[PDB]
Amino acid sequence: VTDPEALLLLPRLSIQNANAISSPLTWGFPSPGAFTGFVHALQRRVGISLDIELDGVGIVCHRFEAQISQPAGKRTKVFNLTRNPLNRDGSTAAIVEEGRAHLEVSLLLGVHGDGLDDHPAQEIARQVQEQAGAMRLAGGSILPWCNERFPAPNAELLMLGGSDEQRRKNQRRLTRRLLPGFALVSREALLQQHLETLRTTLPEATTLDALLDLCRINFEPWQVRDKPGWLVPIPAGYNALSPLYLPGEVRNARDRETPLRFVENLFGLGEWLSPHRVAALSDLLWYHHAEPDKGLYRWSTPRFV
Template identity: 35%
Template sequence: MIDEVKKLLIIPHIAVHNANALSSPFTIGFPAMTAWLGAVHALQRKLNSQGIDVKFKAVGVVSHDIDLQTYKGSNDFVHSIIGTANPLDKTGARSAFIEEARCHLEVSLVIEFDNLTLEQREPLVQQVTHLLHAKMKIASGDVKRFATPFCLNVTEGNDEEFKKLQRHLMPGYALIERRDLMLDAMNDKQDALQALLEYLTIHHSYETDDKGSVRWVKYRKRVNNKPAGWIVPIATGFYGISDLATAKNQRDPDTSHRFAESLVTLGEFKMPHRLHFVEDLLWHYQSEGDYYLCQQAKFAKPESLDSDDTSIESEF
């Protein structure tokens, strides 16, 4: 990895309105990694159709701000989803609908690309700018604004070049994969869901002094006697539960259809200045057998995609 030159397209500070916050059937919050890689793949296909022969190899996501559309009253125990106002039916009543969790957020995308010469980079930036202004969707949300995209070469192991990239991404938090935490817990014979909840649960305890005063303390699980960091559950792909076949009224008649479950594992939001290589923040597609994953290179090993995979399957 050292001395490898990364060709990067940076799209800074994209403000996305009403993005899909229901990242899996049982998690709510930051959109799934499949949404970000899917949006970049859609962008590549639009560029290819317009004569720009670019290939997007990997994607990094840096969050600058997020506003989850939920509400909690003063006496409420849980948060409620803030729904959209849907039209009344013919009887004047509210029509039945499934509430969709939404969020407004601002992110920067770091996209590794290939197949372009130096002369082709300016048309790439111009066309990306045009497509984003043309109301392209990202994570099911509307793009409200973004800073000017630009291209950058970063040599892995070159601190000065990497610091230049870091300056464009600060302040913010890069989403990285922490499947290793679940793997360590499961090696200790913990169930996958139990391992995930163990890192997310906030514990409360109290201490009493000599005078009888009570002080409440809250804490989360530590790793190597240090805080585990900003750990979150993230949806990173799908697991096929049926054979490839043709379904009635499928959207793409040329692609086989199959039912799938979503996969959830642990991730961590980490400030870019704590990373050392571009590869530390990039996510790649990885498929093996029935698994269709978005994951980072350090976990992209076929042996990690067997029946003991450290992701949690849930019905999708």
């Protein structure tokens, strides 16, 4: 909601062994729920000793590879597993399947606090990076440096105090540091828009998302067409099955302080657009916003349109 003044680039985050299932109906790149949980986990450890805030994340995703294998006679995939230790009788344990992938990621944060005028912003950049290099980005660890120990420091720059001409040179200087990536935004208006193509059939909604991430072909009145983006099904929050429980009610909870619901996933849509296609970089940022009483929990990116 609150537009930040300065954006914080976390330039290279080579992370290993992230989760790659992310919902019961998708696989591949992890959910942006992991990224906004990561930035509020930065908020509870750094942002109070700097008296700043950090709300939104610019998910860029330079590289991607998944620990998958192509079997014989199939065009599908399976996942490469770990070998778990034995049971107490010496026999072998069962198999729970955890997909796994390596990533390389850039990040764009948003500051809102009095520490930006109480400090140099280099203090904010150094402290946020040196603490975030001891955390887990999606489900896996954040790696230290290598041959790539030259892009290690950050950058940070405001947008309100300054001229209004060479800020194009400034944000396209920023774009020189995230140039091979594909940003990930929320494009859920097209899920509305592809019901009118099915309005001749029914006003149903659950099979509309399963129409866009594939190759639909009819014959000549072969029918291939340019898909209008890199449009992919992402998960987009939780919807309540069960009423809110008082913090001593549910057996085997993580906490004895917070209240608990039983929820399940809701599915949206995204696109892997290059950052050139959007003018202002503050459009990309992902935010948590969810109303508590009726149980709809959701994350999206505002300011995209």
